[PDB]
Structures are given as structure tokens and as C-alpha cells.
Design brief:
Helix content is 6%, strand content 44%. It is mainly beta. The protein has a 7-stranded mixed sheet. Strands 2-3-8-4-7-6 form a 6-stranded mixed barrel. The two termini are 25 Å apart.
Length: 330
């Protein structure tokens, strides 16, 4: 089997991408944030505290003839940005782009943190990291991809995120028309539960490539590119007037600037992020200070190849017995 679904930016900045997911019988379609940095499929629901729902579409398990309460199971998650959610668990039929999994754990939120409530466009998350990170207790549950894998034509999914435009998540096949050149594959460590890999270096604009190992994660659920402070300083030094602002929370730059590209290495291959992809717009409405799309990871503990980096590539998440990642230009 295969599946193919379009993923759409939630706003004009590409802050996140939403993908329609069918849950239950009859189908209830919710728009979920596919997140290769986490491993829970959780949704706003008829059980979510009413004051914490503000415009999201909810899953109502009592209206699904295939929903079954997973007795005794609870979940609770906290994300790298400080947001969180928790609740109970159903199993139900879940379909993405024509690919159907029966008995998928659907984690129904009883509580969500304010940042979720305040974002009316995201109805929940669909985790695509390794199932070892799933938070369901006392019986950990499998991700949608883990449940589908054995049925897929090939045990892979691909992320093709658009810049200021829709893109595609495919399951079970590699669309050879969706990229240019060849796909360069690189090793993955699953020791932390992430799609963790090592970039071979970087360049700023037309500058020389610096060969240096940068360990990080491929994370579709993170907006920006978070890299070591040395790398980030080298980038922003090429933008007149750019500076790190403690009060804003990162590097800012004059909105009048033209940003240089940023290149990262995948083995001997190179992925070029155009400068425009690094502009996240005014820090507040009407400001002439703009927020940068490349930020320091120093306070995170891990480097993160988020959407800024991934949307410059066609990315293969190869879930074979020994997982690997693939990157192609497009």
C-alpha cells in the first residue's frame, strides 16, 4: 500500500504545516501537524476542557463506530517549545492520503497548553519519530508509520515541504519526479528516539564550505533551523545590522536586508536554503526588526534541522531495519 497527502502552511510565514487525517467511522477529518520529532498522535476532542478549545476541529469518539477506549491508558507530553498536552486514549481507524491503519492509538486531549488553544489551525499532532518516545502509559503505543510499515510497498515516508506553498507527505514510495539530481542517504542514530544524523558542514552565501560534523535531528514539527552558536554567528555576521536580542529571544535583522543563502552538507552533497527562507518577518506588527530563521541551539541541547532546512529538500525517512535519511535538492 501507499498514501499521499498534501501538507499546507498554516500561515504566511510557514510557521507549521497541516495535513488532513481521517479518524473514525464515519470519518472525522482533522488537520494535524506531522511531527518527525515526536511520537504521539494526539487530537483536540470532545473531552478537551471547553475553555481550551478555540476554533479547532475536534474528534468525538462516541460518534465513531470503530472507536474503542484503551482501558487505563493515559498520555502526557511536553514539547521543546514549552507547550504540553495530556489525556486518555482510544484506538480507531486512521487514514492519511488513502493509507489506512486500523487500531491506531488516538490520544484524546483532556488538557492542552495555551499555545495549542491559541492556534486554531492545528487540530493535533501526528508523531513520526520512533515509537520509543511515545508517552502512552502503562502500555506504550506505536506511531502511525510504525503500524503501517509492514503493509507499505517500501518502509519509507517522504517529506516535501513547500516554501510559502503546499507540499506533500508520501508513505510507502519515493516519487522520483519530486526532486532533482540524486538522493544522498546518510546514517541515523535512533538512540534518542529521533531521526538523528550528522551533517558534514555548512557554507554562508557564496562563501567557502566549512567541513565540520553537526549532529542534529530532522524535525518537521520545528519551524526554524537551530545550529551551534559558532555557525549561527557566522551566518548573521553577513547581514548588516543583525544581532542577537535577549529581549526578543534570538537573532533579529533589519527588514530591509537581503539575506544570504545557507548551505548544509549531506555527505558529499549540498542542500542550499535560499536567503528568503530565513526571513520570519517583523518581530511585532509594523516593526522594521525581523526575526531570523536560523537560531542558536545552545540552550536546547540538540541541533534541529527544522522546516527552514527541510523545506529546501526532498527528504526520505527510511524506516528499514537500519533506518537512514535521504536528502535531495528539488
Amino acid at each position: 500500500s501507499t498514501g499521499s497527502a498534501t501538507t499546507t502552511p498554516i500561515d504566511s510565514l510557514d510557521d507549521a504545516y497541516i495535513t488532513p487525517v481521517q479518524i473514525g467511522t464515519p470519518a472525522q477529518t482533522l488537520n494535524l501537524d506531522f511531527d518527525t520529532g515526536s511520537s504521539d498522535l494526539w487530537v483536540f476532542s470532545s473531552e478537551t476542557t471547553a475553555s481550551e478549545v478555540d476554533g479547532q476541529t475536534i474528534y468525538t469518539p462516541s460518534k465513531s463506530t470503530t472507536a474503542k477506549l484503551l482501558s487505563g491508558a493515559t498520555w502526557s507530553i511536553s514539547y521543546g517549545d514549552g507547550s504540553s498536552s495530556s489525556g486518555d486514549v482510544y484506538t480507531d481507524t486512521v487514514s492519511v492520503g488513502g493509507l489506512t491503519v486500523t487500531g491506531q492509538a488516538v490520544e484524546s486531549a483532556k488538557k492542552v497548553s495555551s499555545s495549542f488553544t491559541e492556534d486554531s489551525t492545528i487540530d493535533g499532532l501526528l508523531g513520526l519519530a520512533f515509537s520509543t518516545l511515545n508517552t502512552v502509559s502503562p502500555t506504550q503505543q506505536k506511531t502511525f508509520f510504525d503500524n503501517a510499515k509492514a503493509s507499505l510497498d517500501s518502509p519509507v515516508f517522504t517529506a516535501d515541504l513547500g516554501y510559502h506553498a503546499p507540499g506533500t507527505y508520501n508513505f510507502g514510495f519515493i516519487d522520483t519526479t519530486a526532486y532533482t539530481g540524486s538522493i544522498t542517504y546518510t546514517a541515523v542514530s535512533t538512540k534518542q528516539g529521533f531521526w538523528e544524523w550528522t551533517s558534514t558542514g555548512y557554507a554562508v552565501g557564496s562563501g567557502t564550505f566549512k567541513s565540520t560534523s553537526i549532529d542534529g535531528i530532522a524535525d518537521t514539527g520545528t519551524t526554524l533551523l537551530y545550529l551551534p552558536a559558532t555557525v549561527v554567528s557566522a551566518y548573521w555576521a553577513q547581514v548588516s545590522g543583525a544581532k542577537s536580542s535577549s529581549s526578543v529571544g534570538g537573532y533579529v535583522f533589519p527588514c530591509s536586508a537581503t539575506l544570504p543563502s545557507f548551505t548544509f552538507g549531506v555527505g558529499s552533497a549540498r542542500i542550499v536554503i535560499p536567503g528568503d527562507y530565513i526571513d520570519f518577518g517583523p518581530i511585532s506588527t509594523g516593526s522594521s526588526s525581523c526575526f531570523g530563521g536560523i537560531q542558536s541551539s545552545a540552550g536546547i541541547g540538540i541541533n534541529i534541522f527544522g522546516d527552514v532546512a527541510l523545506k529546501a529538500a526532498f527528504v526520505v525517512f527510511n524506516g528499514a531495519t537500519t533506518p537512514t535519511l535521504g536528502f535531495a535538492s528539488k
